[PDB]
């Protein structure tokens, strides 16, 4: 079956999931592990045989597996992943813009620099033209 056991690593034909693990095991593996060690191999929580449920597929009403690759969930998923990328991109651009826009406002000395040049050159002229 398509289920792969977490512990043996094989594609199982006796799929069982345990409530504490949230994980998939072979029946033939987990019963002896419970018998010899009483413990979930994954979480190291306790186990008992009532905590185990066996998986099935292909019952009545069970929808056909979509294999066409496109789907509404997967398109909405990747449209969401586009949106997250563009917002975090736009956020860093907005941060970059704020930094640049902040410092060029603080850097607005240039008219006061011009008055200092006027003050310096007029002093220079009066100091140059006294002889």
């Amino acid at each position: 079956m398509s289920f792969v056991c977490g512990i043996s690593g094989e594609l199982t034909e006796d799929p069982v999931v345990s409530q504490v693990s949230g994980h998939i095991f072979d029946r033939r593996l987990i019963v002896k592990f419970i018998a010899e060690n009483g413990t979930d191999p994954i979480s190291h929580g306790e186990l008992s045989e009532d905590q185990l449920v066996s998986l099935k597929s292909g019952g009545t009403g069970s929808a056909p597996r979509n294999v066409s690759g496109t789907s509404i969930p997967s398109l909405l998923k990747m449209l969401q992943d586009e949106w997250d990328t563009v917002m975090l991109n736009s956020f860093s651009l907005r941060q970059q813009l704020q930094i640049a826009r902040q410092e060029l406002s603080h850097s607005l000395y240039q008219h006061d620099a011009a008055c200092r040049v006027i003050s310096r050159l007029s002093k220079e002229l009066t100091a140059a033209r006294e002889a």
């Binding site: 997250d84 990328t85 975090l88 991109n89 860093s92």
Partner: peptide, 13 residues
């Protein structure tokens, strides 16, 4: 496109 932004798009992808 700033290099930081282009690279952070690609890294997220």
């Amino acid at each position: 496109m700033p290099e930081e932004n282009d690279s952070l798009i690609r890294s997220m992808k």
